[PDB]
């Protein structure tokens, strides 16, 4: 009957133009509207935004468009003592302030097989890439950048898919930037450097050169944007965890507080 909120991004962080505000609770929220009413988001410059629930425990807030760089955001989660439905009360308040850094948008175009990185509108890198093969294609859409890893084992059994099964995989990779909670990454692939710019070889990750993956790891930050276009895949789900922007604003703004 007590629930604790946690807010991301953290206090003092600088994040990319795609970063939503996230308020995650440790129990299911029976009255979503009660939660929304208790969360006050201040923006400077002021912009409209709206809430949308990813699941029963997490609500997201963002504007219609990507954030303007340099925007200052204050989040006041005033849930201490608040009835969140079915006699579940908020355990504490949270107050976070964060800021929007430079606009970093990287676009991966399957017709060119180049990942182009623009910073405040200017091309800074043009990276040949190898994306998902036709049987395991990379979904088109807007992905928010998440965590980064110097080295990681990408193992399909993390997601309940046995390695030696049709959708399975296991690969050790360096310089990995996470772009979906479902396990899509930008990463180093020295083994596919010939194919990059020519042929799709991955199970859905964007394979780039080691130096380009390290560059990406070093210079792209949480909340920056990767857009995938022109692939033979479908579309990144809006409720992936990093796929928020795939939900159209009209649907997002209407919300799902009654669902």
UniProtKB/Swiss-Prot annotation:
Transmembrane spans = none
Keywords from the named record: Acyltransferase, Calcium, Cell membrane, Cell shape, Cell wall biogenesis/degradation, Lipoprotein, Membrane, Metal-binding, Palmitate, Peptidoglycan synthesis, Signal, Transferase
**Cellular localization per UniProt:** Cell membrane
Q: Name one GO molecular function term.
A: peptidoglycan L,D-transpeptidase activity
Which Gene Ontology CC terms are recorded?
A: plasma membrane
Tagged with keyword Cell wall biogenesis/degradation: yes
Q: In which pathway is this protein known to take part? A: Cell wall biogenesis; peptidoglycan biosynthesis
Q: From the record, what ranges are coiled-coil?
A: none
Sites where the protein binds substrate: 169, 182-183, 207
Residues binding Ca(2+): 83, 86-87
Q: Name one GO biological process term.
A: cell wall organization
What the record says about its domains? Answer: Consists of two tandem immunoglobulin-like Big_5 domains in the N-terminal region (residues 56-145 and 150-250), followed by a L,D-transpeptidase catalytic domain (residues 251-378) and a C-terminal tail (residues 379-408).
Q: Additional comments on file? A: The peptidoglycan structure of stationary-phase M.tuberculosis is atypical since it contains a majority (80%) of 3->3 cross-links synthesized by L,D-transpeptidases that predominate over the 4->3 cross-links formed by the D,D-transpeptidase activity of classical penicillin-binding proteins. In fact, 3-3 cross-linkages predominate throughout all growth phases and the ratio of 4-3/3-3 linkages does not vary significantly under any growth condition.
* Protein name in the entry: L,D-transpeptidase 2
Provide the species name. Answer: Mycobacterium tuberculosis (strain ATCC 25618 / H37Rv)
Q: Which gene encodes it?
A: ldtB
Q: Which residues of the full protein are shown?
A: 150 to 408 of 408
């Amino acid at each position: 009957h007590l629930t604790m909120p946690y807010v991301m991004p953290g206090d003092g962080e600088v994040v990319g133009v795609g970063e939503p505000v996230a308020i995650r609770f440790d129990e299911n929220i029976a009255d979503r509207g009660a939660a929304e009413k208790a969360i006050k988001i201040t923006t400077n410059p002021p912009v409209e935004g709206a809430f949308y629930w990813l699941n029963n425990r997490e609500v997201r807030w963002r504007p219609e468009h990507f954030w303007k760089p340099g925007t200052a955001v204050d989040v006041a989660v005033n849930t201490y003592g608040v009835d969140l439905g079915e006699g579940m009360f908020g355990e504490d308040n949270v107050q976070t302030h964060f800021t929007i850094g430079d606009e970093v948008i990287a676009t991966a175009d399957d017709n060119t097989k180049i990942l182009t990185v623009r910073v405040n509108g200017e091309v800074v890198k043009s990276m040949p890439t190898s994306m998902g093969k036709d049987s395991t294609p990379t979904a088109n859409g807007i992905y928010i950048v998440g965590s980064r890893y110097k080295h990681i084992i990408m193992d399909s059994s993390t997601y309940g898919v046995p390695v030696n099964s049709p959708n399975g995989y296991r690969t050790d990779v360096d310089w990995a930037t996470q772009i979906s909670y479902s396990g899509v990454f930008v990463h180093s692939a020295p083994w596919s450097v010939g194919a990059q710019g020519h042929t799709n070889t991955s199970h859905g990750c964007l394979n780039v050169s080691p130096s380009n993956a390290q560059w990406f790891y070093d210079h792209v930050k949480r909340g920056d944007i990767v857009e995938v276009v022109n692939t033979v895949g479908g579309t990144l789900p809006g409720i992936d965890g990093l796929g928020d922007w795939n939900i159209p604003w009209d649907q997002w703004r209407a919300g799902n507080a009654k669902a």
